[PDB]
From a paper:
Because addition of retinol to enzyme assays considerably reduces the SI of scopoletin in NbUGT72AY1, crystals grown in (apo)carotenoid-containing solution are expected to represent productive protein complexes. Co-crystallization of NbUGT72AY1 with scopoletin, UDP2FG and retinol yielded seven different structures (A-G), which were grouped into four classes (VI – IX) according to their molecular similarities (VI_A, VI_D, VI_F, VII_E, VII_G, VIII_B, and IX_C). Although retinol and the closing loop between Ser309 and Thr325 were not visible in all structures, the spatial arrangement of helix H2 (Ile42-Leu59), the direction of rotation of Trp350, the orientation of the acceptor substrate, and the number of ligands differed among the four groups. Thus, complex VI (VI_A, VI_D, and VI_F) presumably constitutes the productive ‘Michaelis’ structure, while VII (VII_E and VII_G) represents the precursor complex, which is still lacking the acceptor substrate. Since in VIII (VIII_B) the scopoletin is rotated by 180° in the horizontal axis and thus the distance to His18 increases to 8.3 Å, and in IX (IX_C) the Trp350 adopts a spatial arrangement that differs from all other structures, it is reasonable to assume that both VIII and IX are non-productive structures. Retinol was not resolved in any crystal structure (VI to IX). In all NbUGT72AY1 crystals obtained in solutions with retinol or β-carotene, the amino acid sequence between Ser309 and Asp327 (closing loop) is disordered regardless of whether acceptor and/or donor substrates are present (II, VI-IX). Although all the crystals that formed in the presence of 0.5 mM β-carotene and retinol were clearly different from their (apo)carotenoid-free counterparts (I and V versus II and VI, respectively), the effector molecules were not detectable in the electron density map and are invisible in the 3D structure. In the presence of β-carotene (II) and retinol (VI and VII), the 3D structures are more open and the loop covering the catalytic center is not fully resolved. These latter complexes are actively involved in catalysis as clearly demonstrated by the increase in enzymatic activity after apo/carotenoid addition.
NbUGT72AY1 is a promiscuous transferase that glycosylates bioactive hydroxycoumarins such as scopoletin and umbelliferone, as well as monolignols involved in lignin formation and various other small molecules. Five distinct GT protein folds have been identified that are capable of GT activity (termed GT-A to GT-E). NbUGT72AY1 adopts a GT-B fold comprised of two distinct N-terminal and C-terminal Rossmann-like domains (shown in cyan and brown in Fig. 2, respectively) of seven and six parallel β-sheets, respectively linked to α-helices, connected by a linker region and an interdomain cleft. The catalytic mechanism of inverting UGT such as NbUGT72AY1 is a direct displacement bimolecular nucleophilic substitution (SN2)-like reaction enabled by an enzymatic base catalyst.
Residue numbers in the entry: 6 to 62, 65 to 310, 326 to 477
The structure:
């Protein structure tokens, strides 16, 4: 079989598509080709294309150029809509690239943002699926959002009662996805539109697994009110993640090698994440006062060398206790290391999966997208994370609170209890993605669905 997987422009959307491609190719002998939509501008992932042009197995990458869209955006236009327009205007280029395909794919594939390709899948009459690369809960939200639109008048964020998704958990108004923060903003309309677009596909892949969200998945499958909207299968195929590159002369890993087991706290706010000047200074102090060992991936604050935004003397005072790394670090290789025993994270789903597959517990610190609905899940339901009393996005987290949180996770028995839960999650994830595992079984049902359309 041939499948073509379509990726959106940023690295954060490319890598998950690659991991899916690699998984299918290796474990299911299905020839794959990734149509990666590029920015045709920044292109800080186009060099990764060069790096990947070298070891292709299947694993055939086709770059697709975008246009310059500065004419359709404005300082105030938000990222969600940005992505939406980029693809929207890339549509013709996709149409052309699939035409002039050497062997036709037999099956199309869309990332959350590349849903507007459905048109060109129906033309040429090819099997079409979407990849929702985070929680089942957020999927349920997206789909049922079209109903909420009509049921609620006024702004979601001001409600005194939680939002009740048929079958799934109750969503507290504060923990809503970014699109639902303001209904007057175009991203909201795009969001509800996305929710509707999902249902039009022949099936929806989700990088979770049954044991993680049993009720929510069962709701998607069987809840009457929801099934009035959905009407097609769901495929929990996760948790999928990057492979480890057992690394040699990386000084972070060499530092970590000199530390004790589960004694280091990794701090990272994902690709793109940045704090305020005040928040960053309070964080810095928190880590110092904790007297705990850490690796801190730092970028400039939002509201240069990484010492002007840091407390004077910090680096010399924290020498031998912490390790401050600029912009990027090898997260997967860190998290897999024996000496890492905690993760202060923004709760991006890839970060979370990388942490849970490793049995590392977390300090949830949600910033954007659905990170608030993931933080909620991790802390409340799953019990593998702790969080500040008030959301960080609403109020400044001061040094005392931080230093406690870090203390509570890397010293106290409560911390160890949380860790033990994360290990259980790890094991359950392993059992799936294993032969006989529900997630593995989910692809086998996917491949069955694909072959059925071909005959
Ligand atoms: O210093 C670094 C920083 C990142 N990475 C890697 O980049 C990826 C980041 O994805 P992740 O889900 O963790 O966060 P991010 O893309 O920043 O945030 C959104 O990710 C998605 C995009 O909106 C969204 O689904 C999610 O809700 C958001 F959180 C992930 O594979 C990390 O391992 C790294 O190796 N080192
Ligand atoms: C780029 O910012 C994003 C925001 C959202 C919001 C809701 C959601 O389900 O997915 C997202 C994925 C993103 O990549």
């Amino acid at each position: 079989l041939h499948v073509a997987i379509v990726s959106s422009p940023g690295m954060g959307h490319l890598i998950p598509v690659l991991v899916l491609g690699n998984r299918l190719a290796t474990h299911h002998n299905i020839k794959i080709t990734i149509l990666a939509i590029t920015t045709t501008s920044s292109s800080a992932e186009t060099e990764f294309l060069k790096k990947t042009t070298l070891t292709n197995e299947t694993i055939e990458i086709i770059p697709v150029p975008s246009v310059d869209i500065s004419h359709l955006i404005n300082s105030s236009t938000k990222i969600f809509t940005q992505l939406r327009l980029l693809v929207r205007e890339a549509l013709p280029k996709i149409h052309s690239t699939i035409a002039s395909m050497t062997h036709r794919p037999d099956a199309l594939i869309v990332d959350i943002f590349c849903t507007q390709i459905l048109p060109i899948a129906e033309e040429f009459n090819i099997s079409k699926y979407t990849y929702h690369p985070t929680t089942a809960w957020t999927l349920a939200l997206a789909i049922y959002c079209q109903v909420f639109d009509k049921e609620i008048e006024g702004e979601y964020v001001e409600l005194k009662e939680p939002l009740k998704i048929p079958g799934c958990k109750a969503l507290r108004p504060d923990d809503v996805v970014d699109p639902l923060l303001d209904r007057s903003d175009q991203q909201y309309e795009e969001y509800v539109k996305l929710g509707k677009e999902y249902t039009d596909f022949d099936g929806i892949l989700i990088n979770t697994w049954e044991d993680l969200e049993p009720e929510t998945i069962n709701a998607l499958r069987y809840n009457e009110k929801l099934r009035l909207l959905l009407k097609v299968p769901v495929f929990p195929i996760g948790p999928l993640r990057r492979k480890v590159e057992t690394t040699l002369n990386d000084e972070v890993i060499q530092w970590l090698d000199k530390q004790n087991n589960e004694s280091v706290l990794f701090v990272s706010f994902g690709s793109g994440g940045t704090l305020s000047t005040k928040q960053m200074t309070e964080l810095a102090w928190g880590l110092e006062l904790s007297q705990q060992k850490f690796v801190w991936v730092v970028r400039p604050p939002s509201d240069r060398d990484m010492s002007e935004y840091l407390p004077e003397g910090f680096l010399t005072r924290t020498k031998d206790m912490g390790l401050v790394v600029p912009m990027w670090a090898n997260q997967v290789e860190i998290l897999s290391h024996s000496s890492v025993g905690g993760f202060l994270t923004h709760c991006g789903w890839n970060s979370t999966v990388e942490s849970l597959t490793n049995g590392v517990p977390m300090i949830a610190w949600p910033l954007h997208a659905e990170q608030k609905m993931n933080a909620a899940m991790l802390t409340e339901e799953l019990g593998v994370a702790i969080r500040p009393a008030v959301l960080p996005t609403k109020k400044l987290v001061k040094r005392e609170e931080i230093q406690g949180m870090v203390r509570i996770l890397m010293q106290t028995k409560e911390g160890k209890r949380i860790k033990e839960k994360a290990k259980k999650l790890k094991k359950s994830a392993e059992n799936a993605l294993s032969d006989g595992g529900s997630s593995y079984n989910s692809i086998c049902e996917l491949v069955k669905d694909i072959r059925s359309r071909e005959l």
